[PDB]
Design a protein around this ligand. Structure first.
Ligand SMILES: *[C@@H]1O[C@H](CO)[C@@H](O[C@@H]2O[C@H](CO)[C@@H](O)[C@H](O)[C@H]2NC(C)=O)[C@H](O)[C@H]1NC(C)=O
Ligand SMILES: *[C@@H]1O[C@H](CO[C@@H]2O[C@@H](C)[C@@H](O)[C@@H](O)[C@@H]2O)[C@@H](O)[C@H](O)[C@H]1NC(C)=O
Ligand code: NAG
Length: 369
């Protein structure tokens, strides 16, 4: 998820691993976490200028050749350097199951593709116009035009709406993509604007917040304040960020966020930013009932019901009725059930940091001072 930076995180079923460019070394990457493939597969002496991560893989932009070099255990992302030839790339961005690479000016041809992408349902060349930056969602990638600074997205739009609902006309300084939404900092005034049919935008942007950079998970978004350089995170199923430590940059996994401290002496910190819950779909609509929800199901809160309800329509015929959704069975890799499924909420998951002894190699989301 997100864009290229000095730090990156892999996430998903294979574990959670934080990779960072060591400035004390020759811009060589060093990783740690539960995604063992993304730790020990890292190139041991390949100088890199940037990093980006996805579901079980991390890709770096080489210094020498300025081409993508990927490692990890994602079946849709090839290990090593993809079939590029002579092209060179300005930036990288990794989604769940795909990598996108913004071509350098020297490798760009007029009226031709600006981005090369590899991955599931994403392998090909895209936007036929120069872009400044690129960012990747779960199943899509976005970018800002060099001409008018307006955003454009490509890929699978299902569940997000980020391609058609893109604010073509607003000019952005930078944009970051979450799992099903995109947030950006406006060029004029540096306000934060987001789009995409996601519960990460259920409450909206924190009032009066000016950020320098943004990162986003599946259903959450974090930002660094302009002055204090302190993190401010919001979104779905988010618990009440480290308030003390200022950061120079952030990076977001699917359900955790890591930050490179502004002070180079202090080590990296990571914290959980939520957990997945079963939500009603077209195929699994959920039971509208006037009575409390039966065992094994929970009453979806009225706030999210209104958010998931179409324009000018109620989700259940009788608005007072409870919408009962099946309780989630289990937690994703690295997390364990912290709270049981009640009649009012789904089961809550937290990252299992109990097996973090010496030479245990636990999740990257468990690293605090
Ligand atoms: C911003 O600039 C881009 C690139 O110059 C524009 O994208 C092109 O717009 C023309 C005119 O509609 C289309 O014929 C092309 O197919 C577009 N190219 C691509 C790759 O999509 C974009 O329309 C401009 N937007 C604004 C608001 O100025
Ligand atoms: C692969 O991604 C597709 C996205 O395609 C885009 O949206 C559709 C509606 C068309 O306008 C197409 O030209 C666009 O490129 C998804 O529609 C499709 O379901 C995805 N397939 C799988 C197997 O995930
Ligand atoms: C729970 O799942 C079963 C089987 O997948 C389905 O038939 C049922 O409708 C679901 N219950 C609710 C309340 O959605």
């Amino acid at each position: 998820l997100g864009s290229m930076n000095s730090v990156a995180v892999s996430y998903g079923g294979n574990g959670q691993t934080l990779c960072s460019l060591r400035a004390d070394k020759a811009n060589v990457v060093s990783c740690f976490g539960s995604d063992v493939a993304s730790v020990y597969g890292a190139p041991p002496r390949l100088p890199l200028v940037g990093l980006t991560g996805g579901d079980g893989f991390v890709c770096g932009l080489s210094m020498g050749s300025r081409q993508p070099y990927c490692w990890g255990n994602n079946i849709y992302v090839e290990a090593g350097v993809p079939a590029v030839g002579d092209r060179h790339y300005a930036a990288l961005s990794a989604g769940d199951n795909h990598l996108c690479a913004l071509r350098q000016s020297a490798s760009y041809v007029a009226g031709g593709p600006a981005v090369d992408c590899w991955g599931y349902n994403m392998t090909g060349s895209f936007i036929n116009a120069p872009l400044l930056s690129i960012t990747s969602g779960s199943f899509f990638s976005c970018g800002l035009f060099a001409a008018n600074f307006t955003p454009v997205c490509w890929g699978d739009e299902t569940g997000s709406g980020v391609i058609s609902t893109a604010p073509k006309g607003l000019e952005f300084n930078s944009i970051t993509a979450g799992g099903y939404h995109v947030c950006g900092i406006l060029q004029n005034g540096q306000r934060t604007f987001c789009w995409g049919r996601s519960l990460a935008l259920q409450d909206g942007v924190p009032k009066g917040a000016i950020f320098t950079s943004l990162v986003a998970g599946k259903f959450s978004t974090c930002g660094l304040h302009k002055d204090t350089h302190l993190p401010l995170c919001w979104g779905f199923t988010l618990p009440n960020m480290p308030t003390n430590v200022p950061f120079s940059a952030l990076v977001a996994g699917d359900y955790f966020v890591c930050g490179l401290p502004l002070t180079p002496s202090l080590p990296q910190q990571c914290w959980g930013s939520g957990y997945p819950v079963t939500l009603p779909t077209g195929i699994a609509p959920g039971m509208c009932s006037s009575l409390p929800c039966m065992s094994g199901t929970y009453s979806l809160s009225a706030e999210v019901v209104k958010a998931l309800a179409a324009s000018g329509a109620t989700l259940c015929p009788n608005p007072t009725d409870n919408l009962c959704i099946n309780c989630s069975k289990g937690c994703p890799s690295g997390m364990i059930e912290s709270v049981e499924c009640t009649s009012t909420a789904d089961r809550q998951c937290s990252y299992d940091c109990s097996h973090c002894n010496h030479n245990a190699t636990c999740s990257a989301a468990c690293y605090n001072p």
